[PDB]
Symmetry: D2
Subunit: 460 residues, 4 copies
């Protein structure tokens, strides 16, 4: 019984066992988050340096060979960043001069948006904001400041970020989560690097963190390969009771576009410290599966928590069960999609087959992962083994709902792709004799040009 929601697990020091408190030891430890249900590790280049990142990547390539399973490599960029008080205390506040881009009536928030300073006056002397306090609270050395609803001219791509992804593209990554995507352009420029440097295979998840990115969700979905729902920044930058509705609506739109969405931040946050999750958190990751998410993500829980292995297995088991109730309660609705291509109508016909019968497995023989993404779109009640013929495409499919990618030789004009499909499934022990599978391919290899053939086969 396989887990179909993918897990994106952030890495950090928690798994890195430093001289007993060291590669092959902590590679044998992250190879355990792989066996536990992690499909992609996140490297947040906001909390490390290239020397620390470049190392923690060669050590995961070690764990893949320990565990036998491969995983995806995702770089998260850093992107635009910016004494206890009591109410009414009118004060003020001081590399871009954001002076004329924040206006009166805005709100300046410090630390997880925990202290509000409404800007009441435009002091123009020392270029300062005459603000005042709305609630008692702190300002600590170096904590996040968000000025919501403002459109501060941050670069489409900050070169701090430019250098970061360029280093990732040369170690060997598969995805880039772009932080603070406000327009399609913030995506296009990271795209222009992936093609310039010869890495068209990389997939871009835009992170939606503020109102600029929600009011542009369409044109961003169009330009990106996925959406990461960075709820943290979004839950400061827009009303905190609107991220449940914005999350339901993002998962639906992104599924409609045939792309991947990842639901992020705070999913098992207690389990950073304590060894068990609140039932508010088991509710959350469960509901993300019913809203249609491709993948659930661990941030702090996996990177710098006491229980890194525990929060993967936890998510894994919640995800595993919540998949069992998508028939009854599922919110995605494939029956409303326009089938906009021959491969997509085929993907529909496969969903129909799994609804009509007990299909154990769908197999697709796919060069670029297109029919695998499209089958995944329709969320069949069966797992999708995607036989592809190049590791980059294989790794590129590891966040798609239900997809199990697997390398095999590109087939010649003279070999039953249908026996190959049965053979590779059984080798993987995903089907036992008498199981029914749905195999799709473009046949005959040579004249096919797209997936064009659906076959129902019972395993010998």
């Amino acid at each position: 019984m396989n887990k179909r929601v993918k897990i994106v697990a952030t890495l950090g020091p928690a798994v890195e066992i430093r001289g007993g408190k060291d590669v092959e030891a902590s590679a044998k430890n992250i190879a355990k988050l792989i066996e536990a249900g992690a499909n992609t590790f996140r490297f947040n280049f906001s909390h490390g340096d290239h020397q620390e990142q470049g190392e923690r990547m060669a050590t995961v390539k070690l764990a893949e060979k320990i565990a036998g399973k491969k995983v995806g490599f995702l770089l998260d960029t850093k992107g635009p960043e910016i004494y206890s008080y009591k109410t009414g205390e009118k004060i003020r506040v001081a590399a871009l001069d954001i002076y004329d881009d924040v206006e009166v009536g805005r709100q300046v928030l410090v630390d997880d948006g925990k202290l509000g300073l409404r800007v009441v006056a435009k002091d123009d002397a020392t270029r300062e904001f005459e603000v005042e306090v709305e609630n008692d609270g702190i300002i600590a050395k170096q904590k996040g400041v968000n000025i919501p609803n403002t459109k501060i001219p941050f670069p489409a791509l900050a070169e701090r970020d430019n250098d970061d992804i360029r280093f990732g593209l040369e170690q060997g990554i598969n995805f880039i989560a772009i932080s603070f995507v406000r327009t399609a352009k913030d995506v296009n420029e990271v795209r222009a690097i992936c093609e310039e440097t010869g890495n068209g295979h990389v997939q871009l998840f835009a992170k939606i963190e503020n109102q600029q990115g929600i009011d542009n969700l369409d044109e961003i979905i169009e330009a990106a390969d996925g959406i990461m729902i960075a709820r943290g920044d979004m839950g400061i930058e827009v009303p905190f009771e609107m991220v449940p509705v914005y999350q339901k609506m993002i998962i639906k739109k992104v599924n409609a576009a045939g792309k991947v969405v990842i639901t992020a931040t705070n999913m098992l946050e207690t389990m950073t410290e304590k060894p068990r999750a609140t039932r508010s958190e088991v509710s959350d990751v469960f509901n993300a599966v019913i809203d249609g998410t491709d993948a659930t993500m661990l941030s702090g829980e996996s990177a710098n928590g006491k229980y890194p292995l525990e929060s993967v297995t936890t998510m894994a088991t919640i995800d595993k069960n919540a998949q069992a109730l998508l028939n009854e309660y599922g919110r995605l609705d494939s029956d409303s999609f326009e089938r906009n291509s021959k491969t997509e109508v085929m993907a529909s016909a496969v969903k129909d087959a799994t609804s009509s019968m007990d299909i154990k497995l769908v197999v697709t023989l796919t060069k670029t992962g297109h029919t695998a993404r499209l089958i995944s779109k329709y969320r069949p009640n069966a797992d999708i083994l995607a036989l592809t013929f190049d590791e980059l495409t294989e790794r590129g499919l590891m966040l798609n709902w239900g997809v199990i990618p697997m390398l095999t030789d590109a087939p010649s004009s003279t070999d039953d792709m249908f026996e190959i499909a049965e053979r590779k499934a059984v080798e993987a022990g995903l089907v036992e004799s008498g199981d029914d599978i749905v195999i799709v391919a473009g046949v005959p290899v040579g004249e096919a040009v797209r997936t064009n053939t659906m076959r129902i086969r019972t395993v010998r």
Copy 2:
């Protein structure tokens, strides 16, 4: 545009030209006539054995075999068995023989004169056929008058038998005993429902039979005349659910027996038979013995063709409720999906027995269904399934590309042209595949 609903035309004198003189005033003359019913959209000729001798039926079936040669199209051959058979308000009268309750009605001449038995009968309103509604009278499940006729038919070469006055599975099974004992298992059996006992046992009759003939004449006398609309909707639904074929019969373009144009109730009634889900519509008297036989076929074909353009909006069958009971079904379902997802011009099934062509027809895709079959008897046996166009082809070799043969037979048929998308289903590889197991979406070159 191809007529999906099939027409069963009852044969008789109205087209048979005897010594140059028409009916009511020579097989080559009558063959050029029958050739015109065929191009007009007759898919199957009916031979009602209830009115005719064995000399007559033999000679007509002669005439249509020539008609196919003239017409360049084949049709099916249907034998209608005859089977079981038999004053003013207040006159008191008796009649002479255990199955008739004192309370039953007797009706002489086509259910118009009413004898309500009281011990002895009494008239109720102001060698004839008699009905006794709501009685389980033990007519032989297999009569002998019929037993001889059926054997006489299978002799000549027939594809269907319509069993008059079915009321239990026994009445069909014993006619199916005769077909697989003469080595014509290939013959398909329509169970005419005509009375309450038929309707009460309709499920077991559907199961035994290959299809129902909704026999509305007798059925109008035997059940209350205002429930046959209700029965017609519920029989078409159930037969369809059982992957079988339902003919809707008698009185359809009635006044076209005498006048050149149909009443607006008649047009409405053919029209609604399609919307309810009929596989076929039937002309009885209208084409057997009537002044405008070809105009009756042409009118029904024109009506049938329109009503199918509205099956999506108005249509009553609903394939989403069906349970796919075999791997061939879930692929029939998956074909219907394909035709819903994009503009598909034709379904092509390569089919040894026509099983696959029937499950596809069952699902009623929005596309015609070209059936590529390898013997004349499977071919003719598919001519009453909704939307199936039977086309004889050479059995594909172990090297032939059957998706190519599907395209070439369809372009030969003139059912497709360069640009059209088609769905093609097959058993691959040929011979070793136990059932249709492959679906292809092919663009026509």
Copy 3:
């Protein structure tokens, strides 16, 4: 079991006794109309379920029409039930050519048009030099400038309003203008209460269907001529699309022509005629019509009774097979939302009767738009609005005293229902009214009450 689908029975010589002799007995014409004998012939059609009589002003002079309407006013008193009076206009016409208003059609019949003869059985193709194509006169797809209202129709409608009619059925409606011109006669002469049914009978009438329904009080599908003027195999699609639309408009539809035609000669209808009446009801029609079958046929009483039982049986299956859908309606007024809530109530429990205290019949029309699964008793306060309700689906009109501001209309409602013989005790009814009387502007209260 009250028949909720109303019937329109055309009257004619078939029910009329002329000196002991029935219609067709040798020497029946130029005799003495036995009016009291003819009145209890007619009176039995009324009991058998005829809800309104059609006087077809194409096959009668003004005196014979005037006399028959008299006989029907008697028949009511025998039957102890009242019916509506319907005038069917002659309309624009051409016959073998004689044209109405002696018009010259020559400058607007283009070439490539058809010319049909006798019930559309023989075709003539304009090349008028015209060729025969196969072995009354219609000219499909033309816009012959027939006056929006001729004069013979003007005089027919006026004679009829004088006698006292409740409905007019306007022949060959091509646009709203044909309707608004008869609506002006009706208002000009005091008869603003009269209701107009447009007969859609041709391509321009169908092309203009929306604006016509907007002008009229409802539609008479006259499938006869419609099937000569448009491709015969469309009449079903048009029947279904007109019923759905006239219902979305909360107006009345009548399905008509050849419905039980075999019964005009032989005494039992064919299977396709029983089919046709059944499907009309399942389609959504308020009303089924008889023409020849009841006017000059050998079994007018039987054809009425047959239509009634098909209609009574068909209605019991509207819940399954029924084509109309009151769920997609937009409720455009507070009375409609009350109509909606009545219909919801008759769906949650068994309701044997809905009652409405209606001054104008509005609430009655809006309730019957929603096709609740009960009967509708309309208690109205004059014979004009009572009779005017008589072709609305499921509506039983009954005249009662206008309630006073010191009256329980809910007890009035129960008392009248028990008087009519529709309820017994323990039955559940929905009652609807504007309370308090003389202060409520509109039907604003519903109540569920045990008899």
Copy 4:
């Protein structure tokens, strides 16, 4: 814009100022202004005396806030109070060991292969052998005491339970949540106390904490007046990954029954020691409102947190956003209910009017509060003003979805309840001139059994 989803706030030291009261009265007072609808006194963290004066404190809180609220008492209910491989032992013996509630021999009920979870389902002791002769247990360590999936005959009515139920009924309460309900009888011998005392008007909420209570859900719902989903204990008694399944299915069965349902546990949990909620917490609160819950519960977040007023104002914000997405995402579907009574069917028409037109308010003239409970079940798109004529059913409606309980003098047989209906709502500040409202009542008053008539009126 009023709030329809009710809040149950648990009171504790956190709002109270020796214990003063007039100072504690004006903390509790703005909890009511925030949205707190019913106060919960968990009678397992305090004696009869202290919890007595807190109920005295809130009723003057009521009269400074200018709104009345409800009184819920949670029984202590049944209880058992007391690294890998360690083969320890634990004893069934009493007064030696387990502090079984009211003392019991729990031996011949806990079979081998069960599981003894000490310290909040923290530690796991897999029972491996039974010492039939001694009667103790032989366990083996795996990774308060809960023993899942066993029918321990816990005191169906302990006198410790019997004691505090009677002190509440004397002090003026409204609801009793009954802990660890496992059969119908656990509500009967507490309802038999209420009818006894002359307090049949009080309503009982079965707290479902264990598996027996989930196997017996139907007959308990039949016997109780509501369910409190105690996701605290439930997460330990059943597999933690199914409490979101069981929560969704509980709320459905409870709302089909026409009874109240409360989502409790861990809901705004971080809002105890931190000032803003996790994004998994807000999604949790949000989802239970889409699930169709009548009320949402704060425990320690208002009983002993740093931010009790803020926990209620935030929960009040999430409830009023989720309520506005009920016509789109709502899991409850009233179109499937059978309409059993003539009051159900009148409630069904009120629903109809709120979907046929803009209905600002539905008003019920009710005495039992029945009609207001049938209307609430069908969840009309509008608030419910329930007029009833005594503070002893006025209080009991305060946990029903959407209903604003308001008291006035019972009407005379010579009046139009409708006029007084329009008159309360205008005084109540819920409607202005032109508002369309739906009034339901039984007429004529003094000779009419059930709720009888429905009227549509536009506010004078």
